[PDB]
A paper describes a structure:
[name]-Cas systems are prokaryotic adaptive immune systems and phages use anti-[name] proteins (Acrs) to counteract these systems. In the type I-F system, after pre-crRNA is transcribed, Cas6f processes the pre-crRNA into small crRNAs, binds it, and further assembles with one Cas8f, one Cas5f, and six Cas7f proteins to generate the crRNA-guided surveillance complex (Csy complex). [name] forms a homodimer and further induces dimerization of the Csy complex.
Therefore, we made another [name] construct ([name] Δmiddle domain, short for [name]ΔMD hereafter) by deleting this region and linking the remaining two parts of the protein with a “GSGSSG” linker. We solved its crystal structure to a resolution of 2.10 Å. There is only one [name]ΔMD molecule in the asymmetric unit. The structure of [name]ΔMD revealed a two-domain architecture, with an extended N-terminal domain (residues 1–72, NTD) and a globular C-terminal domain (residues 136–228, CTD). The NTD comprises a five-stranded antiparallel β sheet and a bent α helix. The CTD comprises five α helices and a single 310 helix. In the structure, the two helices ranging from residue 181–198 of AcrIF24CTD (colored orange), almost perpendicular to each other, constitute an HTH motif, linked by the characteristic sharp turn (residues 189–191). In the crystal, two [name] protomers with twofold symmetry interact with each other with several hydrophobic interactions from their CTDs, extending to a length of ~113 Å. The results showed that mutating F212/H216/Y217 to either alanines or glutamates changed [name]ΔMD to monomers as indicated by the assays of gel filtration chromatography.
Residue numbers in the entry:
A (entry chain A), B (entry chain A): 1 to 71, 137 to 228
The structure:
Amino acid sequence: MNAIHIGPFSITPAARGLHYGGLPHHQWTLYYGPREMAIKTLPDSYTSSEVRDEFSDIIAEFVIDARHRYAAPPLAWITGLLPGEVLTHDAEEWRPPTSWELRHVVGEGSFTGVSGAAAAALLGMSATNFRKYTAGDSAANRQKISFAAWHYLLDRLGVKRAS
Amino acid sequence: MNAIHIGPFSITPAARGLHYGGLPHHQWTLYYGPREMAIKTLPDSYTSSEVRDEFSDIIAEFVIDARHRYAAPPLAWITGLLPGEVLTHDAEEWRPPTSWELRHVVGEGSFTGVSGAAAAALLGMSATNFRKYTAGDSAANRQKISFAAWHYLLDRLGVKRAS
């Protein structure tokens, strides 16, 4: 496979390839989480960066539509895509973000463009310690960001004021 | 002794008492950290709350003078009393606040009036865990608040915007 992950978006190749014009091909699907966004059949000689370029315009259109739909700090529209329980200031009913929810706001392909190391620096923590927030393959056994650090990070990123 | 601590202020009794009007007396000194603020000789039958009431007006005058001198969030003037290294957003040159600096902003006698348990709730942590930030008698071996939690707390208290 070797799926391509661009923030909260993913591009996945089909299990079984195809053949077109005497060359191997593959059907790639672009998803926003579970939501199927687009499909394109592309040659096998394509680098992953070439596939990312192929789907970048659909991603940018997603961003434009979300900016208009969820119109405050400059990136407040991102809060329209996050569940209320990760945004609430009631710590008793708050829950930490999932990896996908975090990748909405951290990562070069995130909607903020801020890398993991830069976000770690914004929180005063090492990049290796911040990497744990998206590490592993177990949601339940994955390091969770703290309430205070999450809301502080959302303030520093211009997504939601801590107020 | 049994000194009285009111946020960053302390009232200390003299080692050797005195006698006035056939009754035991003690000379109490009110300090703001190391700064001697006032002296009053008061009877031994005074409760600690009575001594606190005796010095409360001088404390309130301190607050008025600081509010005027360090005039933004409503309690921004408190930042005039805190060293720059605990206020800086450069995590590489930041240092955590001391217990005294923390008691500027947390505690019923602090300049915010917000209790330790309420501040803990503002940070999403238990009161017992927050108590560790002012526990013990060793500055070096005292639990330190994190960069993100400290700046988030200062934002939630109305002392300094996280921006």
